[PDB]
């Protein structure tokens, strides 16, 4: 379950209150803060890996009733979310830890915070950097490229 931390950010949208941070309690009993700018795993279908998203906004949406805690995200997509026919355009076999910045507006970016599984570390690498492949048996995901529905391209600014 989730709770806001502290005061809302200076108001921007009507009917919404924005927060920098959200508090998530586990059944391991502890409390974890997730902040705007951090990344989360988002529950998708039960047979698939979580979606990965960067949190770009956290908000209490007063336009739903009863009101809900929401996020707006920047999506990433996993290799398997890219059309099979377009996969070869990458020109290599990405590791399971590699994901792609999804640079397209067609999917809606608003989620309910209850779909959040938890934080994930996502790391931006230069194209010529190699993914570790180090130890920690890492839970970290790496991003090199964006995918626009047409081609792979550099990470946006």
């Amino acid at each position: 379950t989730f709770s806001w931390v502290g005061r809302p950010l200076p108001n921007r949208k009507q009917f919404q209150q924005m927060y920098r941070e959200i508090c998530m309690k586990i059944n391991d009993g502890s409390e974890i803060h997730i902040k705007v700018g951090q990344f989360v795993l988002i529950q998708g279908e039960d047979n698939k890996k979580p979606y990965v998203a960067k949190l770009i906004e956290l908000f209490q949406n007063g336009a739903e009733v009863p009101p809900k805690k929401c996020a707006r995200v920047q999506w990433f997509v996993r290799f398997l979310e890219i059309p099979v026919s377009k996969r070869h355009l990458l020109g290599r076999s990405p590791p399971a830890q590699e994901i792609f910045w999804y640079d397209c507006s067609d999917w809606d970016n608003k989620i309910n915070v209850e779909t959040i599984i938890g934080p994930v570390q996502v790391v931006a690498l230069a194209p010529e950097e190699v993914i570790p492949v180090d130890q920690k048996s890492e839970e970290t995901l790496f991003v090199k490229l964006s995918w626009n529905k047409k081609d792979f391209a550099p990470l946006p600014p």
Binding site: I42, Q43, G44, D106, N112, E114
Partner: peptide
């Protein structure tokens, strides 16, 4: 348990 998010279109 995390609720399921269903991605949906539009809303660009």
């Amino acid at each position: 348990g995390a609720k399921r998010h269903r991605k949906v279109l539009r809303d660009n």
